[model samples]
Target chain A: QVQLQESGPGLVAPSQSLSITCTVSGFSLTGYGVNWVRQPPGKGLEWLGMIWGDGNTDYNSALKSRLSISKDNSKSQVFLKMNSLHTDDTARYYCARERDYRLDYWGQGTTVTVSS
Target chain B: DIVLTQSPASLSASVGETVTITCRASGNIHNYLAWYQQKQGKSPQLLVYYTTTLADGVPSRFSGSGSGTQYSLKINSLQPDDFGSYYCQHFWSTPTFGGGTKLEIK
Candidate 1:
């Protein structure tokens, strides 16, 4: 019964940073990796990045310049931060536990709208 | 970063019919492609991994295949619950996803 829940602001102003946290339950961060994925309005899913339990992080080349993934294994939570957000950055951000090479448990997602 | 491309951006099918979505990668993903289904306002659910292995609890009707730089997801005897957007992701690289295929139940 692995579960992930996302929490963050529903709205963010342009040029600001968007930060979200994912709290995991029924799983240990020491044993798996947490990945971030996002979907633009009415668009397809995109892999944002991932944070492994060992503190290893990787990002999508498109967003690597502004994206950072980190975590607190003691609290079983993962964090995502993106700077200089734009309107196009508005999307539903999700967090999931990586099962081997695939994503398994997923959070319901947090919708962030960047506006002035 | 691998570029995974999916074909047939959209499709329509009747219940019990068969449907398929294709994913082609910019480079070899080595059968490390996985399929996911996403419904409106819902999180994407993994259906198949390692090209053809179904995730635990996934229906047998949902299957996958392909290797090297190409992969595909097939839904046999599609059910109403099967209608949604499907995406293919390559884990062999930095884990890039395809544009996705929208499945409509007609």
Candidate 2:
């Protein structure tokens, strides 16, 4: 019965930042971890990072500088904020619940087109 | 980062046929691997983990095997709903996914 939904603006300008929210139900954020991932149009998936139930975080070494993940446990929401976006960053972003470091449940994802 | 290379960027097979996909990692990763399926326009779904353990609710036709740096996912009998992209992920150090294989109906 776990469900997740992602919401965010559809477009972003190059060099700007992208913000997205993932709302969850049927589970507790403090009990399960959440991770953010992205897939470029017609390309493969990228593992961005995750915020563990204990509030600790880990990120892809390549994107750690520009990525941040935080959650509002009381509100059942997880947030992803990434800055200095480029055209190459355009992709569908997703949030998923993690168990034993494996992604179990995923959100529908939100599209973000990084353009001029 | 432990890199995973998946063979056959794309595959074509018919219903009821059996197919296997291979994933080779750059370094020894033991059995810390998982598999995922992603239909077009849909989020990726976990199929197997720890090399051979099927995830909850996944069909019995889907199976996984391998250790060290090599792994494979096999479909016992293909179904139409199986057409999509398949990705293998490994957690040697940090989680990294394979390039993915596109499975299509032949």
Candidate 3:
């Protein structure tokens, strides 16, 4: 079964950058695309961006200026980086497999706190 | 970007009861909609895709239907585990999600 695991710092200071890694197993990165999603405490889900199998990336219109998604296919890992973080940026970040435009598999998520 | 508007931001239903949540899109999507269920502290799980097709391993109690710009997710004989949040997402455009409907035990 395919699985995703997220790893990153639990806390990030304001105005700093937040980086998270999603490592997958039981699947090849070349054959699938991964999407980044986050949810603020007590809020609904938010789509951050996605790194497609062909190496192209797309970001949520509101976050396009600060979001970046990349991957290392050899390591079966995808990376999410968002700069200029603020309190609103604090959320649980997750990576999910994109299949037929639907998110099929998801990471456990990494809690991120943005405070100074 | 297509906007998804979900109804009844919150609801209370009892076990064995049947409940339905609706999502209306801002523009015609032609059924490119998906529904997801999310527990309090977990990632959202895909329940239905392409409008009415249940996702792999999902219980048959969950069903989806609709067309054009409207869709619905119905949970028949709802169980305790079904109490959570339901979200509708449209992929026809830039991929937008509804605000979500929270389901609690009655």
Candidate 4:
């Protein structure tokens, strides 16, 4: 079965950058797209961005300026980087395997708390 | 970006009952709508895709149908496992998701 795992620092300082990695296994990265999604403590799910199998990426128009998604197909790992993190940026970040428009498999999620 | 407006932000139903959630799009997205269910503290799971096609491994009791600018997800028989926040998404243009409907079992 295909699985996704997210690894990142649990706590990040304000104004610092937040880096998270999604390690994919049991599937070929060249055959699927992985999307990054986040949800605040008590809010709806937000689509941060996505990286296609061919390496093309798209971001939410609002966060496009600070969000970047990169992948290494050879190692089946995807990376997400966002600069200038703020308290509002604190949330559970997840990486999911995109099947067309829908996400089929998801990581357990990594909670990032932004604090001084 | 397509805006998805989901209704009945909260719902309460008893097990074995049927319920439906609606999602209206700001504009036509053809049949690009899909539905997902998210349990507390977990990632959302795809239940239906391409408007009405059931995702692999999804139960038959869960179904979706709609077209043009509207879509809906119907739970044939609500189960304890079905209680969660359900969302609808449009992927034709810029991908977007509904605000979500919180389903509570009574």
Candidate 5:
């Protein structure tokens, strides 16, 4: 049973950095990739970035300058960090496992509100 | 980056009715497309992948098909539990998702 859990702060001030941790179980981080996807309230899903099993990362070109995705294989955890947050960044952040060309397992997202 | 345009921002259908959702990509993405379902207040679930292959545990009532830059997801004999949002994603490039279609029960 593959499981993922996202943990992070509930709110973040504008212009600050937002960091979220995705603790995974029943699977090894070294064998599968993790992707960060977010959805603003009432909005569609957005692909933030991905940290491949081999440790390579790719981010949404629109957010490339402010986003980073990484993982600690030994701890079975993936991390997402983004700077220069704004109101539009307020959304539920999810960490998902990519398998067979699609995301097969996902975590109950963590809500992050960007406010002053 | 390739963009995916989905039509009919929303739809309302009765139980046992059939419905279809469409998605068009900005480029020739071959058949590297997938579909997902997201219920209210929950994470999205993979429904169909690689154009027409249904993921494990998905119902036979759901199907996908398309080629080149166009694709679609169709649900037959809609169930009450099928109401939610459906999104199409293409993996031919950096993996972009279409603006979802919201499905509501009538």
Candidate 6:
């Protein structure tokens, strides 16, 4: 049973960068790509970006300027970093494993708040 | 980026009834689309992929179809557990998702 757990700070100050980690078990990070998706409070899901098994990355046009997805294959973990956080950036962030064109498994998600 | 627009932003249906949700893409997607169901407070689950292929462990009651710029997800004999938000996503382009449709039980 493959599982993913998201870990990071619950709060981030405006104008600062946000960093989150997605730790995985029962699977190897080098075998599958990991994608970062987020949902604002009471809002819809947003595809932030993805870090491929080969280490290449792609981002949503809207967040391309500030979003970065990377991973540590040795630790079976992926990382999400976004700069210049705003109140609107507050949301529940999740990491999911990409299977072909679909995401099959997901992390429980970590809620991050942007506040003073 | 391809934009996916889902119709009937919300719906109310009774158990055992049939329901359909439509998703229109800004451009042709060549059936490279997927559907997902998201329960409140939970992650989205892949129901259909590649336009009409059901995901692993998905119920047969759920089906998908469409080509070009039009697509849809249909639920046959909806169950109580089917009440939730449904979203359509297109992978032909940059991988965009619809705004989503909320389904409620009457």
Candidate 3 lDDT over A5-108, as tens digits, reads: 99999988999998899999999998888999888999888888889888998889999999889999999999999899989998899999998879999998
State the C-alpha lDDT per candidate.
0.90, 0.93, 0.91, 0.90, 0.92, 0.90
Write the residue-wise lDDT of candidate 1 on B38-106 in tens digits: 888789998998888988899999889898997888889988898989999888868888999999978
> Which ten contiguous residues of candidate 1 chain A have the minimum total lDDT?
A53-62
Q: Model 4 misses residue B85 by how many Å?
A: 1.0
Which residue pairs overlap in candidate 3's backbone? none
RMSD of 6: 0.9
User: Fraction of the real A/B interface contacts present in each candidate?
Assistant: 0.90, 0.62, 0.56, 0.62, 0.64, 0.38
With a 3 Å backbone cut-off (N, CA, C), the pairs that clash in candidate 2 are: none
Per-residue lDDT for A47-112 in model 5, tens only?
888998999988899999999888899999999999899899999999999976899999999999
> In candidate 4, what are the lDDT values of residues B1-106, reduced to their tens digit?
8899998899999999999899999999999888889998788988888988998888999988889887888998898988999989888767888899999988
Candidate 4, DockQ score (0 to 1): 0.75
Minimum summed lDDT over a 10-residue window in model 5 chain A is located at: A96-105
Q: What is the lDDT for A60 in model 3?
A: 95
Best-fitting candidate, scored by DockQ: 1
Query: How far off is model 1, as Cα RMSD?
Result: 0.9
Task: After the best TM-score superposition of candidate 3, give how far the Cα of residue B60 lies from its true spot, in angstroms.
Answer: 1.6
Against the true structure, whose TM-score is highest?
A: 5
TM of each candidate vs. truth: 0.97, 0.97, 0.98, 0.96, 0.98, 0.97
Residue lDDT tens for model 4, A3-116: 999999999899999889999999999889999999889878888889998889989998999999999998889999999998999999999999777888999999999999
List, residue by residue over A23-89, the lDDT tens digit for candidate 1. 9999899889999999899998888999887888888888899998888889888999999998999
Off by over 4 Å in 6: none
Candidate 6 similarity to native, TM-score: 0.97
| Candidate 3 ranges with C-alpha deviation above 4 Å | none
lDDT of 2 by residue, A21-107 (tens): 999999999999998989999988889988999999999999999999999999999999999998999899999999885899999
